[PDB]
Ligand binder design. Structure first.
Ligand SMILES: Cc1ncc(Cn2c(C)c(CCOP(=O)(O)OP(=O)(O)O)sc2=O)c(N)n1
Ligand SMILES: Cc1ncc(Cn2c(C)c(CCOP(=O)(O)OP(=O)(O)O)sc2=O)c(N)n1
Ligand SMILES: Cc1ncc(Cn2c(C)c(CCOP(=O)(O)OP(=O)(O)O)sc2=O)c(N)n1
Ligand SMILES: [Ca+2]
Ligand SMILES: [Ca+2]
Ligand SMILES: [Ca+2]
Lengths: 522, 522, 522
C-alpha cells in the first residue's frame, strides 16, 4: 500500500470522512485519487477553512480534518487556531510541505521550520522524518487532537511522501482506541460529594467543556438535586445549560470584583468545564466562599488563582456527580423573570428588538452564533436556548469565527436551523466564507447587525475616557452586495416590519440567506 | 508582604522545604533571608544539582525545587532535564534573571529568551510579566510539575522582583489542592475488567510510572489474581515489581521483533505505566495478541504503534484493577530459576560476580542505581529487589544521572542503604556530585565498575562491525583520587577477596564511600 | 559516494580536520571509518567537549567541529553554548539522532524536537528531512557558523543517514567560499573619518571582536594616529589591545553611571567590536559625548541604548580606519603607571601577588584564561599582555569555560604557554576536562586560586547587605587529588616561596600541570 492509501484508511477507520481545505501544489499528491467515500469542503481563505471545520467539530463533538497549503496557508489560519485553542476544538490541521529534496535549498513553497509556525496555538506540531512515518504521525495527530483536553494539532507533510510505500505494520494503527473518559477515584469523589451535600448555599458555574461533553443534561440534574443556582462562566464560547431553567442565573460578569461579589454568600462554588476565570477589564473570592473546579485541562487547573481543582473528563465527572449527590430538601430556585421589552419605533432596530424577534420566530431547536460584540449581554438574556449545542462565540475573542463556524455547525446539524448574529465590523474578517454556504447549499442564516461602527471598541474607549482613537468606524459597506457577490440570497431590514418579513422569508428559504439589519448607533 | 515572603510561604504550604541549587548573583535576592525551616543543598555543577533533586523527587514521590543561575546554569542542567522528561520527574526548576531594567540592553548574566531555553524538555516554561505575578507563576509551576503526567517545569525570575510588594490576594494560592487521581469510568472499566477475566493467557508489562505511583503492591495482587507473567518494559528507569516474585519474568528485550515474539501466544497484554515501547536498535505484535495500555501520559498513548490506550492515573487504575478482577483458577506462574554463578578467578572481577556479591551482602531494603551500561541485563537478573523504589536508571539514557541521583535518593530515604553501580566512563559526567555527599554526610555507596573503556559502545560498534571508531577508551583515571579530592572515603577492589572486604567496610561506614572495582575488559 | 564520505570531504575541503566529541550509539555510523587525516579529541563531559572546541576556535580564529550524543549530550553542553553565543564563537555542533524509522515511536536515545533544544543559543539549528540532504545541511552549518557575526550552530543527523548514497551534485558544496569581509561604503566612511579627524578629545573602546578579527595591530595604529586613550569594553571575553601601550587605559567599569562618567569630556567615543555595553549591577552618556559603534552583530547595533552604529566586519573596518585617519598633532597619551606591589607575608597569597609573580615568570607570549571571579580587576592591571589572543574569560559569565577552553587554546597555540587562572569554585564545573589535557599531553598550566569560597558571590551579597544567603562556601576540595585522579601532575603553593618554586617547575614541565594556590579569604 502507498502512504496515501494507508493514510486515508487510517482516517476512515478513525471516523474521519470530510476534509476542509484550500488546495495548493504541495497538497496535490494527497488530494489526488480522492476517495469516493470522502467529502471535500472548499473555502476561499484559510481562516474560513478552519472556522468552518471548527464549527463542524464543536457541533459534531468529533475531530475535524483540515488541509492547508504550506506556510502562507497555515499562517492565514493562525487567528482561527487561536479561537480553537481556547475552545478545546479537536482540529487535525495538515499542511503540505515541499518535496524533501527541495526543502534544504528553500525552493518556493517551502514551509521553513514548519512545526514552529503554528506554536504556541497547538497541542502538538510535527513534521515526519520520512515518508513511511506519515501514517504513524497522522495517528499521533488524530489522538492528540481527540484526547482531553481536546485541541488543535499540526502535521506538515512533504509533497513526495504520499506516493511512497507504506509500512505494512501501519495496519496496527487503524483501530486504535484511546480513552480519556476518566473521573476522580471513588474515595476522593465520595469526599467531594459529601462536601456538596453539606453545602448550605451552593452555587454552580458551568463552562464550554460541559456543552462539548454533552454533559448539559447531567448538569441540570445536578443543579436540581443540589437546588443550586447556575451561572455560565464569563467570556462564554458555548451554552452549557437551558437558559429558561428555574436554576439558570445567566452569564457572569467578566470582572474579578464582580464575580467575587456574585459568589459572596455561597459557601461552596462548584465550577465545571470552565477556566477559573476568563476575566476581562478586587478580591478573587470573599471570605466564606470555597471554590472547587472540575476541568479537563491541566493548564486551567494550574493557573486558577484560587480554589481546589480536579483534572478529569467533564462528561464522566458530571454524570458521576449528578447521580451520587443527595436530593436537597432546600427549595428549588425560581426562574429568572423574562427580560423587559425595549421601546422600539418604526426606525432603526435596537438589538434588544432583534433578539426578541429571533426568539419569537426561530425554531425551538435553533442554534445561534454570536459575533455582535456590543450586544452579547442582551443576546444571552433574550434567547431561550433549551437544548445543548445552541450557542457559539469566538473562544479567544478572535473575530472572523462566527460566519464560517455557522456554516460548519449547519453542516454538522442539518436538521437544526443555524442563525449567526454578526456585527458589521466582524462580518468582514471572514466574509469569503459566504461562498462555501452558497456552493454546498448549506442553509445558514446570517443576521448582520449594521450600526456602522466597531461598537464594543467605542464603548470601551468611552469607559476609559480615551479620546482621539482612530479606526473605530466602518461606514460604507453593502452586505447585500457582498452576499450577492458570493451567491447568497440577501435581504435588508431597516425596521421591525422589514425584520419580521425578512426572517419569515429566511426561515422558509431553501438555501443560505443573509439579512442586513440597520441597528441603532452607539 | 514581599514577593520573597509570599513565595516561600507558598512553597512551604505546598509541601516544599528544600532547595537544590548552585547560586549566582541573579538569585541572591531570592536566597537571602533564607527561611530557617528551609534547607539548601549545594552542588558544584548544575547537572549535579538537578540530578540530586531528581533522585530526591523520584524516591520521595513529591516535587523537588531547584534554583539555578541564569542561562549558563540552566544550560548546564539541560542534559539532566532530558532524563527528567522521560522519567516524569516532578522538578520545579527556577533560574534567576537580570533585573528588569537590564534585560533589554542585555547586560551580563541576562537570560535571553529564557523560557525557550529549556524547551522542549519541560511541561511548562515561563517568565512572569511583573513582580507581583511571581507567586501566581510559582503556583502554576508547582501544579504543572505535580499533575499527571508529572514532569519538569521552568520559571525564570528577574533579580529585582523578590523585594517588591506581593498582592495580598496571593494568599488564595497557598492551600490550593489539585488532583489528577482519576481512573476510567465505571462502564468502560467494567468492560476492561471483563476482557482481563476472559483472557486465556494474559501477560502484564509494567513501566516506571507504577513505581512512581507506588502501585507495585497493587500490581502484584493483579498479577496473582490473573495468574499472569509480568515483565518490565524495556529501557527501564525504575523497578515496578518484586524481582523474585513467582510471576516475575524480568526485563524485556528492547527490540521490536524481540518483544513481539516474547508476547506471542498471549491473547491479552496489559501494559501499565510504560511507553509502548521504549525500543532500541519486525512486527509490533503477532496475530492473536491484543494490547491494552494504561498510561498517565497522553503523549505515550498517542505514539504507541499498536493497541488500545487509557490515559489515567496509574495508582488509581492499578488499585481499581487489582480489586475488581476475578481470581483466575489458572495455576500461578512458577518463579524463574536463580541465575548461574559465573566462573571467577582471583583476578579482575566479572560484573556477574559483583552483582552476586552485592546481592549477598546488601540489606534486603537496599536501593540500587545503575549507570554501568554494558552490565544492565546481568544486574536485573542478579539483584533481588523485593521493595518498591529499589532501582533507578537514567530514563533518557543520559549519563551523569546515577551519581548525583544516588545522593538525592539517599537523602530521601535515610533508612535505606543506597548503592550506585556506575561504570568508569559514566562516573565522570557528574563526578563533582561526590562533594555534596561528603559535605552533607549523605552515606551513599558508589561502586565504580572500572574496565577502562566505554564498554557498551564497543559492543554496539562490534555488532555493527563498525571499524576505526575513535574515542571509545577512557584509560588513566584514578577514582580513589577523585573521591579523595571531594572528601569521600575511597577503597579499591582488584579481586573478589578485596571486593568483599571493601563492601563489608562500606556497609559499616558512617559516611559516603566510593569503591573502585577492577572489572574484566570487553 | 556515501553521505559519510561526502560529508568528511566537505569538512576537509572547508578546512576542518578535527572533531571534538563525546561519543554515543547515534554517532557511531558517523565516527566509524574515521578518516586518517582527521583527529578526534575526546572529553569526558559535553560541557568540556564544547569548552575545549570553543578555546580552539577562538584561538585559531576558525570554526571548530563538535560531535555530541542526542539530547542528553546536547543538553549537557548548553551552558557552554551560552558562552559561545556571547563570544561569537564559530562552533559547528552536530548531534546524532535515532534512525529515522525509530523517531516517531520515540525509541530510547531519540532527540525529540531536536532543533528547538539548543535555541535560543544558536544562529541556526536544523535536522535534515532526508539522508541525501545531510551534506547540504552541513554546508549550511559551516557557513552559518563562519559568517559575521560568527556563532554556534546545531545540526541533528539521524543514525541511518550516513551509509546512504549521497547526491553527486553535492560536489558543488566542497569549494564554496563565502565572504562577509565588508566595510562601510566610501562616501559614509569618509564622513566617519572626518568626524574622527575633527574630534578634540576622542576616546576608543574595544571589544572581543577586535581580538577575534586580529584587528589588534590596526587598532593600535588607529589609537596612535588619533592620539586617543583606549579602554576595553566591560565584561571582556578577550584582550583587544596591548595592556602596556601608552594609550591603554584598562578595563572599563561595568556600571552605566561609571561608564558615562569615564567617557565624560570626550566629544567622540569610537567603540569597535563590542556590545554597547555589557553592563552589570544613571545616564548612558553625559552631554557633549557622541558615540559611534562599529559592530559585526546587528543584534548589538539594535539594542545599544545610545549612539550611531555601523554593522560591518571588524577586521575590514579597523584596517580601513587605521589607514584613512590623519595623524593628530595632539600629544600621544602617556602610559599608565605600574600597579602597586601589595604587602605580602609568608602566609596565604594575595591574588595581587599571584598575578605579579605570573607576570614576572611567564613568557612574554603567554596566553592567560580567567575564571577567578573576584580577582578580575587585579588580573587586568597586573599582567602585561603585549600580543593578540592573550586573554579569555567566559563571555556569558558561565563558569566551567576556562578549564576546558585553556586546553583548546593550548592545542591551537602549541608554541605559546597557556596559563589558566581559575578559582576553587569555578574549577569544579568542568573538572573532568583535566583528563583530556593528560591524555593528549596538552601542556596547559592550571593555577587554582583556592580561598574556600565563592568569593565574588560573598562580595556581591556584601554590597547588597544581603544576610543569611546559603551555599556560598566550598570547603573540603583537594585539587591535587583531583588532578592526580585525571593524570595531571600536581603541585601546591601555600606561600610565595612555594608559588615561585611551583611555577618554575610548571614552566619547565613537559605535560599539563595543576598548581593549587592557597589564597587569602574574603
Ligand atoms: C481578529 C480580531 N481583530 C480585531 C479585534 C478587536 N475587536 C473589534 C474590532 C471589535 C468590534 C467588532 O465590531 P462589530 O461591528 O462586529 O460589533 P459591535 O458594533 O457590536 O461591537 S470587538 C473586538 O475585540 C478582534 N477581537 N479580533
Ligand atoms: C551524556 C551522555 N553522553 C554520551 C553517551 C553515550 N554513551 C556512552 C559514552 C556509553 C559508555 C558508558 O561507559 P561506562 O564505562 O559507564 O559503562 P560500560 O563500560 O559498562 O559501557 S553508554 C552510552 O550511551 C550518553 N548516553 N550520555
Ligand atoms: C555555570 C554558573 N553557575 C553559577 C554561577 C554563579 N557564580 C559563582 C558561583 C561565582 C563564584 C566563583 O567562585 P570562584 O571560587 O571560582 O572565584 P572567586 O572566589 O574569585 O569568586 S561567580 C558567579 O557568577 C555562574 N556564573 N556560572
Ligand atoms: Ca458594529
Ligand atoms: Ca566501562
Ligand atoms: Ca574562591
Amino acid at each position: 500500500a502507498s502512504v496515501h492509501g494507508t493514510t486515508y484508511e487510517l482516517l476512515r477507520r478513525q471516523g474521519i470522512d470530510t476534509v476542509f481545505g484550500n488546495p495548493g501544489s504541495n497538497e496535490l499528491p494527497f488530494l489526488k485519487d480522492f476517495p469516493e467515500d470522502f467529502r471535500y469542503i472548499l473555502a476561499l481563505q484559510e481562516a474560513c477553512v478552519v472556522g468552518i471545520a471548527d464549527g463542524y467539530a464543536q457541533a459534531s463533538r468529533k475531530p475535524a480534518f483540515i488541509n492547508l497549503h504550506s506556510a502562507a496557508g497555515t499562517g492565514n489560519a493562525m487567528g482561527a487556531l487561536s479561537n480553537a485553542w481556547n475552545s478545546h476544538s479537536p482540529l487535525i490541521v495538515t499542511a503540505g510541505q515541499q518535496t524533501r529534496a527541495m526543502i534544504g535549498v528553500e525552493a518556493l513553497l517551502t514551509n521553513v521550520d514548519a512545526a514552529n509556525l503554528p506554536r504556541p496555538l497547538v497541542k502538538w506540531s510535527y513534521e515526519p522524518a520520512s515518508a513511511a512515518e506519515v501514517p504513524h504521525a497522522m495517528s499521533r495527530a488524530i489522538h492528540m487532537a481527540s484526547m482531553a483536553p481536546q485541541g488543535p494539532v499540526y502535521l506538515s507533510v512533504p509533497y513526495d511522501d504520499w506516493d511512497k510505500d507504506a509500512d505494512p505494520q501501519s495496519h496496527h494503527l487503524f483501530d486504535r482506541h484511546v480513552s480519556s473518559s476518566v473521573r476522580l477515584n471513588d474515595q476522593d469523589l465520595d469526599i467531594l460529594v459529601k462536601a456538596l451535600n453539606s453545602a448550605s448555599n451552593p452555587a454552580i458555574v458551568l463552562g464550554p467543556d460541559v456543552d462539548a461533553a454533552n454533559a448539559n443534561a447531567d448538569c441540570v440534574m445536578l443543579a436540581e438535586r443540589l437546588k443550586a443556582p447556575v451561572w455560565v462562566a464569563p467570556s462564554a464560547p458555548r451554552c452549557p445549560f437551558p437558559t429558561r431553567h428555574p436554576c439558570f442565573r445567566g452569564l457572569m460578569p467578566a470582572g474579578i470584583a464582580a464575580i467575587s461579589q456574585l459568589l459572596e454568600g455561597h459557601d461552596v462554588v462548584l465550577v465545571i468545564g470552565a477556566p477559573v476565570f476568563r476575566y476581562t477589564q478586587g478580591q478573587y473570592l470573599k471570605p466564606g466562599t470555597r471554590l472547587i473546579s472540575v476541568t479537563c485541562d491541566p493548564l486551567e487547573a494550574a493557573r486558577a488563582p484560587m480554589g481546589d481543582a480536579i483534572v478529569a473528563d467533564i462528561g464522566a465527572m458530571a454524570s458521576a456527580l449528578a447521580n451520587l449527590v443527595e436530593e436537597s430538601s432546600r427549595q428549588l430556585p425560581t426562574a429568572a423573570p423574562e427580560p423587559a421589552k425595549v421601546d422600539q419605533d418604526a426606525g432603526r432596530l435596537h438589538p434588544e428588538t432583534v433578539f426578541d424577534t429571533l426568539n419569537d420566530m426561530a425554531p425551538e431547536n435553533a442554534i445561534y452564533l454570536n459575533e455582535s460584540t456590543s450586544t452579547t449581554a442582551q443576546m444571552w438574556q433574550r434567547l431561550n436556548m433549551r437544548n445543548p449545542g445552541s450557542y457559539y462565540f469566538c473562544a479567544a475573542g478572535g473575530l472572523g469565527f462566527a460566519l464560517p463556524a455557522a456554516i460548519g455547525v449547519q453542516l454538522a446539524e442539518p436538521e437544526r436551523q443555524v442563525i449567526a448574529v454578526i456585527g458589521d465590523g466582524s462580518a468582514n474578517y471572514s466574509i469569503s466564507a459566504l461562498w462555501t454556504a452558497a456552493q454546498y447549499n448549506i442553509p445558514t442564516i446570517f443576521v448582520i447587525m449594521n450600526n456602522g461602527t466597531y461598537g464594543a471598541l467605542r464603548w470601551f474607549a468611552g469607559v476609559l475616557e480615551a479620546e482621539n482613537v482612530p479606526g473605530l468606524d466602518v461606514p460604507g459597506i453593502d452586505f447585500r452586495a457582498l452576499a450577492k457577490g458570493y451567491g447568497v440570497q440577501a435581504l435588508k431590514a431597516d425596521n421591525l416590519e422589514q425584520l419580521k418579513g425578512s426572517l419569515q422569508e429566511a426561515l422558509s428559504a431553501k438555501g443560505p440567506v443573509l439579512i442586513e439589519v440597520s441597528t441603532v448607533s452607539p
